[PDB]
């Protein structure tokens, strides 16, 4: 006849899980992010939390293809800088971005689809507008894929 | 450069065909997703979408349609259902690889997404081809007709086939209504019609009513185990129309078995079962009342034309008993009984 | 120079993960809860989320003992009714309890240590007090382990 | 029943010893935790706690103490540090098995938890046994003394040993302060003392000051790589006390090299380095001022007893230059220079 809820718990549990990762313990996956300029990186992490975070990951390890039980598989998207900042989000609900790399960070969110952490850049950039730098901005919005600022582009 | 786009497409076309071949085990998800992502990113979603429709259509027409057509006279439903599960399984992996197109391009160009496109090609090229359309309609209807006649049929094959017709309706029942529901209700109305002619031809009114309840229940249990829940109401109305509505005055006035007779022998339960059945249809209770008014008025004028008062109190008490115990103290029945009493008590 | 947070995310992510469990997919553990009266139960689940939830689990699969990589190991605590209600909490932050089994549920939270879901019973029971049934109540509080209601026992 | 409690304890005692033997691989966590849970649940936490202290003490005295005592003259720190890591590793698993006692019983009876008890038994029975206590103190101090003399030493063995003394302080530094910091500061004060006698005996005041800065920096870098951050302030004060405080008047008045001499040849930087060093200690700047007052007043009376005015402006400008560029426009120095000028300018 009862039924309870604890709002402090998804947060708390999520902390405990980060700590479980950062001890590089209990992980079921390891990612060799490798891109042209930068040297290859290995990130130990939990399959299940990655899927919680991104749909491109949910499907990666999913009923899908040869990433069924790999324990170790590559990613060749962007600098592993952004896969780190991203995983930081996927385990902490928070992401520290920079006045410079936010392009690469956002394009990251875009490629593996983290529409939350993408819309947070959508609203990240509105702040320090430049009529000087507006040009490249709109270039991103149309190139990016989501014409979501391309309209809001004044 | 466009020629590498052709190479991306060759990788994707080969991959899709390997998935359609169920050889997805050994395909790198990342490379197919990333390449599809790059194609859409450089605004080649239109080229990618056309290719997808071509490969999926090509696959379902040259292979799936023939496989289904070859099972027409030997375990048809098993193979068709097999083709449907294989289609859904392949399309999930295919929809995953083109997820980026699915979130940017299909949104911009008001076109159906990868999974719905897969359903449309399957619906139009397989389920509704023609020879297949007619054979699935005959089969499902033939099964319901055998079961109604007392035969035992595979209810699961029907549930899987009807569910398929529902999904192919694309969050609608258009496919299920046109291909299955409409002919099902037609042939059912005819079956219940010949059933009513026989039941009216032999059985008493009480037995007829019990067999109508039994038929109603039999069709509901059939809907719960074979058909779609949304078909419950239409089938019952057809059962209600053919067995009750079209014979309302016939049933209540059935010679030596009808309503007036039940009233004469105080068969309280039989009148209550009649009420329960006739309250389902419009003008059902109106017919019961017109029949009752004729009997109650006929009884009252003959009674008015210590024993006389006990006879009148037993007649009033009898019909008050009938009203509470059988007619659920119905507003219509209470007004009718009262109005009739107000007619013959005022006459002299 | 920026830094964002999304409070809706621990919740949302946690839903996605439940759904990943209930599909009995991506799981790294399977529990054969087995107790005297009841027949043995198998629960597929994620090691990492169980640890997020309970410390007795964090340590179970931990650097500790032979539960290092088992994929399948028993538990002989209470009826698997409560391990189900509990896992429901561990994946949803919510637990539907009953006017009857709440003893067994709470003793569950107690044994694997879920002090949140234990204090929620601590306050569960205060509601329908019986001066008739108060006796057994205090018997629980002293037997239980935590003399946390034993004082509040009026 | 109590006899099965004895069986639970036998299972736990055997398990703990297998963990101490590092044979934890093959121990069912659940059974040891659940049994420990059941023991505490039936209020036998006192019996379980006593047993734990007995087995842990028994293990560290009969095995660990002897192993450490046997390495006294052959790679002592490596084995002691090895015993400490093995102790911490075993105690984690042991603290996990008795988690239920750790949350109910130790809370009720104001006793140290399983992990702290493990630290206490290790601290008292090993680190502070006696022969071990003295040998670890001599070794660490011997290493710092060799490094200060120019030898190269294993800084990591010191960092691991000092960290251990810190932890065994039980979220305090009592163990580290008594066993290490106190004797370290003692022997350091003596080393810096003999170092000052030599430096004062040969080198100029400028060279002495540069060597004091170099010694201060050398000890800080040593604290960052070997000792505990909380030792930074005490060691610098000892360096400051033995090299500066105790020789304040000696340094400024060093014949043909001191403050007045730097003032005579306008060695601006040397005076600034002296200020930087003397501002660290109490009464440092007071000594510099008393020395300056004596020189500035002596210069001013001889000057007052176009060339006379340019001589006085160059002397005022010279000391204003000294105040801004060397004395950081110090409040004390500005008041002193002004007060001295107010004395000799008012005399005649």
């Amino acid at each position: 006849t009862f039924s309870y809820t604890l709002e402090d718990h998804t947060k708390q549990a999520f902390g405990i899980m980060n700590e479980l990762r950062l001890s590089q313990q209990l992980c079921d996956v390891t990612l060799q992010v490798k891109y042209q300029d930068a040297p290859a990186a290995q990130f130990m992490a939990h399959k299940v939390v990655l899927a919680s975070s991104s749909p491109v990951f949910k499907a990666m390890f999913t009923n899908g293809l040869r990433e069924q039980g790999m324990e170790v598989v590559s990613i060749e998207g962007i600098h592993p800088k952004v896969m780190e900042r991203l995983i930081e989000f996927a385990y902490t609900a928070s992401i520290s971005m920079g006045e410079k790399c936010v392009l690469h960070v956002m394009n990251g969110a875009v490629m593996y689809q983290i529409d939350s952490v993408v819309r947070a850049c959508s609203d990240f950039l509105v702040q320090q507008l430049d009529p000087s730098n507006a040009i490249g901005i709109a270039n991103f919005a149309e190139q990016i894929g989501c014409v979501e600022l391309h309209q809001r582009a004044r | 450069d466009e020629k590498y786009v052709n190479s991306i497409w060759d990788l994707l076309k080969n991959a899709i065909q390997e998935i359609q071949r169920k050889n997805n085990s050994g395909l790198s998800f990342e490379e197919l997703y990333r390449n599809a992502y790059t194609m859409v990113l450089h605004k080649h979603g239109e080229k990618l979408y056309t290719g997808l429709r071509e490969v999926v259509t090509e696959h379902l027409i040259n292979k799936v349609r023939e496989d289904v057509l070859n099972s027409l006279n030997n375990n048809f439903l098993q193979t068709l259902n097999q083709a449907w599960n294989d289609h859904q399984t392949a399309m999930v992996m295919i929809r995953d690889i083109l997820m980026y197109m699915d979130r940017v391009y299909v949104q911009q160009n008001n076109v159906e997404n990868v999974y719905n496109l897969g359903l449309i090609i399957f619906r139009d090229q397989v389920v509704r081809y023609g020879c297949i359309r007619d054979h699935l309609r005959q089969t499902l209807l033939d099964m319901i007709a055998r079961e109604r006649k007392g035969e035992v049929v595979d209810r699961g094959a029907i549930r899987n086939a009807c569910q398929m017709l529902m999904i192919l309706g694309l969050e609608g029942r258009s496919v299920y209504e046109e291909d299955f529901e409409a002919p099902f209700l037609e042939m059912s109305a005819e079956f219940f019609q010949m059933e009513s002619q026989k039941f009216l031809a032999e059985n008493s009114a009480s037995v007829y009513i019990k067999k109508v309840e039994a038929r109603i229940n039999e069709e509901i249990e059939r809907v719960m185990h074979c058909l779609d829940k949304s078909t419950e109401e239409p089938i019952v109305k057809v059962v209600e129309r053919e067995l009750i509505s079209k014979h309302m005055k016939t049933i209540v006035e059935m010679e030596n078995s009808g309503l007036v007779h039940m009233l004469k022998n105080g068969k309280t339960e039989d009148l209550g079962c009649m009420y329960k059945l006739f309250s389902r249809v419009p003008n059902g209770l109106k017919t019961m009342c017109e029949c009752m008014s004729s009997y109650l008025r006929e009884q009252g004028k003959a009674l008015v034309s210590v024993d006389y008062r006990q006879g009148l109190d037993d007649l009033k008490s009898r019909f008050d008993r009938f009203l509470l115990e059988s007619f659920n103290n119905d507003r219509l029945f209470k007004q009718t009984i009262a109005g009739d009493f107000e007619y013959f008590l005022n006459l002299n």
Side-chain angles (χ1 to χ4, degrees), chain A residues 1-19 21 23 25 27-31 38-41 43 45-46 48-51 54-55 57 59-62 64-65 67 69-70 72-74 76-77 80 82 84 87-96 98 101-102 105-109 111-112 115-117 120-121 124-126 129 131-132 134 136-138 141 145 148-149 152-154, chain B residues 1-294 296-306 309-348:
Chain A
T1 50
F2 276 58
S3 102
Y4 177 88
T5 8
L6 194 152
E7 275 191 349
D8 287 285
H9 172 282
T10 54
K11 331 221 152 171
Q12 186 173 42
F14 245 79
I16 291 199
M17 274 186 273
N18 197 25
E19 137 84 70
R21 166 181 70 124
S23 324
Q25 68 189 337
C27 299
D28 42 12
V29 86
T30 338
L31 294 144
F43 297 59
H46 298 108
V48 9
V49 185
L50 288 177
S54 140
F57 273 59
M60 176 145 199
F61 314 87
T62 90
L65 272 44
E67 281 80 351
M70 287 289 291
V72 36
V73 148
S74 203
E76 312 180 330
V82 302
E84 191 221 53
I87 270 156
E88 272 183 39
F89 180 80
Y91 278 79
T92 70
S94 206
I95 165 156
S96 244
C101 61
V102 65
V105 176
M106 176 166 14
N107 206 338
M111 183 216 171
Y112 297 102
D115 264 24
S116 16
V117 213
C121 295
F124 172 125
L125 299 144
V126 311
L129 149 140
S132 61
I137 307 173
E148 153 251 304
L149 292 321
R152 301 158 202 179
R154 180 189 179 262
Chain B
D1 195 292
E2 39 185 326
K3 57 171 172 193
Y4 279 54
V5 184
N6 184 87
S7 275
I8 290 164
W9 166 241
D10 280 355
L11 266 180
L12 292 160
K13 183 185 61 187
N14 263 322
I16 295 154
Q17 282 176 333
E18 282 303 301
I19 291 151
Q20 290 168 335
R21 286 165 191 150
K22 297 167 142 187
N23 213 324
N24 48 269
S25 300
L27 288 170
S28 163
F29 177 78
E30 202 255 23
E31 189 153 325
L32 295 176
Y33 175 85
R34 188 176 66 59
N35 284 309
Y37 160 80
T38 303
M39 254 189 109
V40 180
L41 186 80
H42 285 246
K43 310 292 139 181
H44 296 290
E46 201 158 294
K47 319 185 163 67
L48 183 53
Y49 195 87
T50 304
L52 154 78
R53 188 169 59 230
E54 174 222 0
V55 181
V56 176
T57 304
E58 189 173 299
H59 170 69
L60 296 172
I61 291 177
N62 297 330
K63 164 137 177 63
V64 178
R65 194 202 278 161
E66 299 308 299
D67 292 340
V68 179
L69 278 166
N70 292 340
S71 323
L72 289 170
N73 308 303
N74 189 11
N75 270 301
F76 174 73
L77 298 179
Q78 189 147 30
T79 308
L80 184 59
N81 197 59
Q82 183 61 68
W84 168 235
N85 289 321
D86 286 358
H87 176 76
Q88 286 191 111
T89 304
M91 285 307 298
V92 165
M93 285 184 276
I94 288 154
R95 182 196 89 215
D96 285 354
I97 278 141
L98 312 168
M99 203 176 266
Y100 187 76
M101 193 192 71
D102 228 31
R103 286 296 197 289
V104 169
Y105 181 88
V106 314
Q107 299 304 287
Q108 192 66 44
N109 296 265
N110 330 310
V111 290
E112 299 274 14
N113 58 57
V114 190
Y115 201 79
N116 280 343
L117 178 80
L119 293 179
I120 288 155
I121 305 161
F122 193 82
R123 166 188 81 190
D124 294 4
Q125 305 307 327
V126 187
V127 174
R128 306 180 91 104
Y129 172 64
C131 338
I132 298 155
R133 190 151 69 171
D134 298 323
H135 198 69
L136 179 68
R137 186 183 70 249
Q138 176 74 356
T139 304
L140 292 181
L141 296 186
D142 191 52
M143 285 167 93
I144 296 160
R146 268 184 186 132
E147 195 176 66
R148 282 168 174 157
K149 277 154 212 167
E151 210 180 296
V152 167
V153 292
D154 189 345
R155 293 186 134 175
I158 305 160
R159 198 184 303 180
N160 291 332
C162 291
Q163 193 60 21
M164 173 185 73
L165 292 160
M166 278 292 292
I167 291 155
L168 296 166
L170 267 66
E171 281 196 309
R173 69 198 316 273
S174 11
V175 180
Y176 175 83
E177 206 283 319
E178 286 171 279
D179 284 34
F180 176 74
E181 196 173 78
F184 165 71
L185 296 171
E186 208 188 2
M187 159 284 292
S188 289
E190 284 175 11
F191 173 96
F192 308 139
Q193 186 51 87
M194 290 288 283
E195 186 99 323
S196 68
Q197 282 170 7
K198 153 187 188 180
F199 291 174
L200 283 159
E202 320 190 302
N203 311 139
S204 66
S206 306
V207 173
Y208 184 86
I209 286 155
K210 207 182 176 189
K211 266 166 171 166
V212 180
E213 303 270 31
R215 176 52 66 190
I216 289 157
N217 297 332
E218 202 198 293
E219 288 309 316
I220 289 161
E221 208 215 7
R222 181 174 272 104
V223 168
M224 303 305 123
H225 289 319
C226 318
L227 308 173
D228 190 80
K229 188 109 183 191
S230 61
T231 313
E232 198 191 340
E233 169 191 276
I235 195 64
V236 164
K237 283 186 182 180
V238 165
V239 178
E240 281 170 359
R241 187 183 76 240
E242 297 301 320
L243 298 180
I244 318 150
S245 285
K246 280 181 183 178
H247 302 285
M248 284 192 286
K249 190 160 148 168
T250 298
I251 299 148
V252 301
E253 288 170 357
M254 197 193 279
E255 169 164 315
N256 281 274
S257 165
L259 191 138
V260 167
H261 173 64
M262 269 135 177
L263 244 188
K264 204 190 177 182
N265 296 284
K267 300 277 121 187
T268 292
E269 206 193 300
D270 296 340
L271 283 157
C273 294
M274 187 180 263
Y275 174 89
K276 251 173 197 160
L277 191 80
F278 277 66
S279 59
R280 294 175 162 266
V281 294
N283 295 338
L285 302 175
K286 180 223 79 181
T287 304
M288 277 184 77
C289 279
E290 283 176 358
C291 186
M292 181 186 69
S293 177
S294 189
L296 177 56
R297 279 182 181 150
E298 263 330 294
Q299 287 285 105
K301 281 194 285 163
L303 220 170
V304 297
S305 177
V306 202
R309 287 182 327 289
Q310 201 111 77
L312 312 143
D313 295 326
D314 286 327
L315 185 74
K316 188 164 159 54
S317 288
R318 227 164 211 183
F319 277 82
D320 281 337
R321 193 192 192 187
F322 285 128
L323 178 66
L324 209 92
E325 291 158 16
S326 311
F327 308 129
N328 188 50
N329 194 102
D330 198 302
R331 207 184 150 208
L332 190 74
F333 282 85
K334 189 158 189 165
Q335 273 166 74
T336 302
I337 289 157
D340 300 328
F341 262 87
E342 287 153 354
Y343 157 77
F344 53 78
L345 284 165
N346 182 56
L347 217 75
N348 179 276

